[PDB]
Amino acid sequence: AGSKADRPSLQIQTLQHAGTTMITVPSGGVCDLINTYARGSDEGNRHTSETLTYKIAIDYHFVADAAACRYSNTGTGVMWLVYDTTPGGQAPTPQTIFAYPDTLKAWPATWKVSRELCHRFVVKRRWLFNMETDGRIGSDIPPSNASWKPCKRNIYFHKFTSGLGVRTQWKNVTDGGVGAIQRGALYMVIAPGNGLTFTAHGQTRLYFKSVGN
Amino acid sequence: AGSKADRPSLQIQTLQHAGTTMITVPSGGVCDLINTYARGSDEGNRHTSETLTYKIAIDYHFVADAAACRYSNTGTGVMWLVYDTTPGGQAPTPQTIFAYPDTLKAWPATWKVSRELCHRFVVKRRWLFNMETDGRIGSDIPPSNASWKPCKRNIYFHKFTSGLGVRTQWKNVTDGGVGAIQRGALYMVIAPGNGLTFTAHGQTRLYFKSVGN
Amino acid sequence: AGSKADRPSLQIQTLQHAGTTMITVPSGGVCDLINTYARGSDEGNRHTSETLTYKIAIDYHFVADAAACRYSNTGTGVMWLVYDTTPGGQAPTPQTIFAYPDTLKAWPATWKVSRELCHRFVVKRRWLFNMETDGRIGSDIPPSNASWKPCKRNIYFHKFTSGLGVRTQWKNVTDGGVGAIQRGALYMVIAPGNGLTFTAHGQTRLYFKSVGN
Amino acid sequence: AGSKADRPSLQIQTLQHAGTTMITVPSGGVCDLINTYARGSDEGNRHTSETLTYKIAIDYHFVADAAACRYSNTGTGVMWLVYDTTPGGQAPTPQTIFAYPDTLKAWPATWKVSRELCHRFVVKRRWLFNMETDGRIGSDIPPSNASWKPCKRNIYFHKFTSGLGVRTQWKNVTDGGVGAIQRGALYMVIAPGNGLTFTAHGQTRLYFKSVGN
């Protein structure tokens, strides 16, 4: 029950998405890298040129955006955890990672990995969620005559998984940006529901340890 | 199936929250201590300077407050059971126990224990619940034309757990207040949903036995 | 290495001799009882009618008294730890505990237990110490011509012993005075050196546990 | 014969007390922390967030101060090695670490750990020493008529011990001050003799190794 657990404690890294930084997704998703690590004295930074990661836990809040609340429909969203072999010099975008005709852009949940890149990428986890809006903003006061049951306007999403493992190596620099990584990048992708745009709040943690040399 | 059970019966302590005493939570939660014990002849009071606790059961009723019923939205609440090592001379407050930016104050369920105190505190249990309001007070008479289904305006919450155990020692005094405890305090915390305030009714029991000397 | 040690901790009792209370011994010694225990809720008080004691540690400071500093000679002192079977209704005095002619009153260290009481009393420990005075009070300023080496004007005395054990029972009352004890009293006695009077400072601890009933 | 010795060498840290920095103790002792460690590249600084210490050796010179040489008496001093669990935000002082009435302030050697903090502190070593002054400063020329034997005006004190071990963890910063330590602080305390003030010279070494992560 675990993965390569070791009696001494394991290092911790966090991310802060809130306030000024709120992941905001227009239709078509957004690409991002969660594996950023600095190098130096501070704890949580990588001490070596070789890093393995193990366990990851994710917490967030979601909320619909008023911009799309002018309509009433449900939908379905998607969150993937995508592993890379060799990253390009430029940041990927979903349209590049998944070959899809413009018609299917509405419904992401049918997307699957394109065959041309079949050995370049892989997806080690998948998750689903769904949300809907009735066409009413929260701050609006109901009239005294009648009411509403707005179940599941917003949702609380969390997952915890020990299964995965990843091997990463680094070019020699200080920085933690994408350009530094030689191999083993790790991407996170968010896919909105049809014609439904929203922003999210929350934070995540990672677990890893340096090794080698 | 149990924890350190012993053939003779175990002592019992109760708490009464009702009427004049109703836990009432404004946004941002409230700190409290449930482990208070007097010393003396009466049963339920501690006979010694050393106490272990075992099993705990919790029952309550919740109800929304009309003060927040002027709006209609759902939300999510949180109840933690937090264990302490060495209490300060002053009573803690959630903002102190959890480091959180003002932005996240809305959604508690993302809070997690701050790293500075990482070894000073720990959380041995966690629970979730959710509730919502439609913007209508109970005493209001529906008009004869139309009706409502107000499922889950109020909720019945209870849990029973034998798992935990706690070791506590006391300074030498009569009192059962917080200032007496040398080590092993036990806190209970309630986290309201976003912009949703309520009061609760109910009572709880404890189980323990004195030992030592 | 120990006496009837038991995994749970053992109770503690202390005595405070300082300031207003300073044991002060004129020639001929002084009788005292160190075993006083109250009964009640407070820790250190006896919970039962039956008590055993085990380990005892003693610390004090000694200093000569200026009243006797008008002369210059050395001497030798004595400290006994005396155990009793049945105490009388009245407090004993050394002259009663030890039969000695008036001639020997000068040198205590030769005293030994009188034969008439041979089975009524016993001495489970003994200690020696010596001190001397040169005829000069501390606050006095030496003249600029010549000096002194006053080694051992005052002395630091301490002992620690686990050996003894004592069985005591009590009449039924609240008090901790001498009149309460039915059997097993414990006395401490201080014997000054010849024509040498002094006072002492310090404090002591005891170790015991209740048993029975 | 040793403690957790390991074939590769162990790191070394030193302290320099001399010249500008001379520990100087007025009556009532002084609190200090010897465990300070920086973090960085340099040897002797801690490489990690977790440190164990093993063996310690202490050397010093003592000398009486002329300020107190205006009187002639002996006395007795004390040196403790005190271990801490959780340090406060403020530096402790002896009067806080040991509960003592103002009367006993004269003779430290009777002090013992106060009961209120009984589990917060502990003392893993103890040492005694004694010194005295005749009321004559060194630079003073004896008159040609008579002389003096001033044995033990100054003293050479050293100890070496492998027994102890200590577990310490750190908040994440660069600094080596007291505010950084999360748990496991280590204090050194010096207790002067009655009405006898002095300064000391010397230096000490430590032995430890980083571990973890």
Contact B77, B94 (CB under 8 A): no
Contact D184, D84 (CB under 8 A): yes
* Interface subset of D 44-103, CB within 8 angstroms of A: 49
Please state, in angstroms and rounded to a whole number, the distance separating the CA atoms of residues B86 and B182. 7
SS3 state of residue B180: helix
Tokens of D73: 């008496």
What's the half-sphere exposure (Cβ side, CA atoms, 13 Å) at C148?
A: 19
Q: Please name the amino acid found at residue A135.
A: G
Which residues have C-beta within 8 Å of that of residue B18, sequence separation ≥ 6?
Answer: B201, B202, B203
Contacts of D182 (CB under 8 A, 6+ apart): B119, D169, D170, D171
Residue C19: phi, psi to the nearest 5? 55, -120
Tokens of B46: 């501690």
Q: CA B158 from chain center: how many Å?
A: 12
Nearest to A18 among B101, B148, B149 (CB): B101
Half-sphere exposure of C43 (CA within 13 A, CB side): 21
Tokens of B87: 């209490």
Q: Which residue in A129, A125, A130, A132 sits closest to A150, CA to CA?
A: A132
Which residues in chain A have Cβ-Cβ distances shorter than 8 Å to B143?
Answer: 145
**Burial code of A83-104, b = ≥16 C-beta within 10 A, e = fewer?**
bbeebeeeebebeebbebeeee
Which residues of chain B lie closer than 8 angstroms to D85, CB-CB? 86
- Count of A-D CB contacts under 8 Å: 17
- Among candidate residues A29, A11, A46, A9, the one with its CA nearest the CA of residue A172: A46
Query: Which residues of B are less than 8 Å from A202 in CB distance?
Result: 110
Residues 6+ positions from A117 with CB-CB distance below 8 Å: A97
| Cα C15 to Cα A117: distance, rounded to the nearest angstrom | 84
Inter-chain contact D116–B171, Cβ cutoff 8 Å?
yes
Strand partners, D196: none
Rounded to 5°, angle at Cα B212 from C170 and C44: 45
Nearest to D172 among A8, A43, A209 (CB): A43
| CA–CA dist A172, A169 (Å, integer) | 10
Q: Cα–Cα distance between C193 and D19 in angstroms, integer?
A: 48
What six digits make up the tokens of C54?
Answer: 């085990």
Q: Could you tell me how far CA D105 lies from the centroid of its own chain?
A: 19
Coil, helix or strand for B95?
helix
CA distances from D108 to A95, C131, D117, D200, D213 (A): 79, 20, 19, 18, 43
Backbone CA torsion sign across D114, D115, D120, D121: positive
Q: Which two three-digit tokens encode residue D137?
A: 């400063």
* Residue D139: partners with Cβ closer than 8 Å, 6 or more residues away: none
Closest CA to C158 of B171, D38, D78: D78
Cβ contact C85:C120 at 8 Å: yes
Buried b (16+ CB within 10 A) or exposed e, C45-83: ebbebebbbbbbebbbbbbbeeebbeeeeebbbbbbbbb
Query: Quick check: helix, strand or coil at residue B59?
Result: strand
Token pair for C76: 């030798």
CA dihedral C161, C167, C172, C174 (to 10 degrees): 0
Question: D136 contacts in C (CB within 8 Å)?
Answer: 142, 147
Q: Which of B157, B196, B210, B183 is CA-nearest to residue B75?
A: B196
Closest-CA residue of chain D to C20: D103
Burial class (CB within 10 angstroms; exposed 0-12, middle 13-18, buried 19+) of B29:
buried
Length of chain A as a residue count: 213
Structural biology method used: cryo-EM
DSSP helix/strand/coil, B185: coil
Task: Say if CB B181 and CB B86 are below 8 A apart.
Answer: no
Closest CA to B134 of B116, B113, B151: B151
CB B135 within 8 A of CB B73: no
- Tell me the HSE value of B30 on the side-chain side, using a 13 A CA sphere: 12
Number of CB pairs, chain B paired with chain C, less than 8 A apart: 17
Nearest residue to C82 (alpha-carbon basis) of C187, C192, C213: C187
Write out chain C residues lying below 8 Å of B39, CB-based.
41
Q: Name A92's bridge partners.
A: none
Sign of the torsion formed by the C-alpha atoms of C161, C166, C169 and C170:
negative
DSSP for C113-165, written as a single string: --STTTTTEEEEEEEEEEEEE-S--TTPPPPSS-----TTSSEEEEEEE----
Phi, psi of D175 (to 5 degrees): -65, 160
Residue A10: closest CA among chain D residues belongs to which residue?
D213
The DSSP H or E segment spanning A94 is helix A94-97
How far is the C-alpha of B183 from the C-alpha of B94, rounded, in Å? 20
State how far residue B132 is from chain A, nearest Cα, in angstroms.
8
Q: What DSSP string runs through C79-112? A: EEEEEESS--SS---HHHHS---GGGGS-GGG--
Nearest to C42 among B172, B211, B212 (CB): B172
| Residue D67 distance to chain B (closest CA, Å) | 42
| Cα–Cα distance for residue pair D114/C203, rounded to 1 Å | 13
Q: How many residues does chain B have?
A: 213
Residues B159, B32, B170: CA angle, nearest 5 degrees: 100
Closest CA to A113 of A121, A105, A124, A103: A121
**Cα separation of B197 and B67, whole Å?**
8
Residue D187 near residue D33, CB atoms below 8 Å? yes
Mark yes or no for CB contact B120/D86 under 8 Å: yes
Of C200, C64, C62, nearest in space to C136 by CA? C64
Cα–Cα nearest to C136, from D136, D67, D72, D147: D72
What element of type H or E holds B173? none
Give every CB contact of residue C5 below 8 A, 6+ residues apart in sequence: none
> For residue A139, what is the enclosing H or E element?
none
∠ CA A170-A174-D172, nearest 5°, is 110
Distance of CA D46 to the CA centre of its chain: 22
* C171: Cβ contacts below 8 Å, ≥ 6 apart: C180, C181, C182
b/e per residue C141-163 (b: at least 16 CB within 10 A): eeeeeebeebeebbbbbeeeeee
Output the CA angle A159-A164-A170, nearest 5 degrees: 115
d(CA B126, CA B110): 13
CA B105 vs. chain centroid, Å, equals 19
Which residues 178-197 of B have a C-beta within 8 angstroms of D? 182-183
Structure-block tokens of residue C210: 């209740």
Torsion sign, CA atoms C66, C71, C77, C83: negative
The residues near C67 (Cβ < 8 Å, ≥ 6 apart) are C197
Residue type, D64: A
Which positions in chain C touch D103 (Cβ < 8 Å)?
18-19, 201
Asked if C59 lies within 8 A of D110 by C-beta distance, the reply is: yes
DSSP characters over chain D: --SS--SS--EEEEEEEBTTB--EE-TT-EEEE-----BSSSBTBB-SSEEEEEEEEEEEEEEE-GGGTTS-EEEEEEEEEEEESS--SS---HHHHS---GGGGS-GGG----STTTTTEEEEEEEEEEEEE-S--TTPPPPSS-----TTSSEEEEEEE----EEEEE-SSS--SGGGEEE--EEEEEEPPTT--EEEEEEEEEEEEE---
Is C19 near chain D, with CB under 8 Å?
A: yes
Residue B33 sits at the vertex; the CA angle it makes with B29 and B38, to the nearest 5 degrees, is 160
Phi, psi of C54 (to 5 degrees): -125, -75
What residue type is assigned to position D9 of the chain?
A: S
Beta strands of chain B (E only): which ranges?
A: 11-17, 24-25, 30-33, 50-64, 73-84, 121-133, 155-161, 166-170, 181-183, 186-191, 198-210
Q: Which of D22, D3, D34 is nearest to D60 (CA)?
A: D22
- Distance of alpha carbon B96 from alpha carbon D87, whole angstroms: 18
Nearest CA in chain C to B47: C41
Q: Residue D106, exposed/middle/buried by CB under 10 A (0-12, 13-18, 19+)?
A: middle
Q: Are A95 and A28 in contact (CB under 8 A)?
A: yes
- Mutate: best of A20, A21, A62, A147, partner B, most B CBs <10 A: A147
| Tokens linked to B37 | 């014990």
Find the DSSP H helices in B52-186. 94-97
Task: Give the neighbours of chain D: at least 3 Cβ pairs within 8 Å.
Answer: A, B, C
Whether B contacts A, i.e. 3 or more CB pairs less than 8 A apart, is: yes
With CB atoms and an 8 Å threshold, state whether B119 touches D169.
Answer: yes
Residue type, B97: I
Distance of residue C35 Cα from the nearest chain D Cα, in angstroms? 20
| Residues D195, C154: Cα–Cα separation, whole Å | 14
CA atoms of A138 and A142, how far apart (whole Å): 10
CA distance C14 to B49: 18
Closest-approach residue (CA) in chain A for D39: A41
Structure tokens at C35: 């075993």
- A172 Cβ contact partners less than 8 Å away, ≥ 6 residues apart: A49
Distance CA C140, CA B189 (A): 67
Q: Are A75 and A108 in contact (CB under 8 A)?
A: no
The separation between the first and the last C-alpha atoms of chain D, rounded to the nearest angstrom, is 29
Six token digits for residue D167? 């577990």
Give the tokens for residue D171. 């908040």
Phi, then psi, of C95 in degrees rounded to 5? -55, -30
Instruction: Assign B32 to helix, strand or coil.
Output: strand
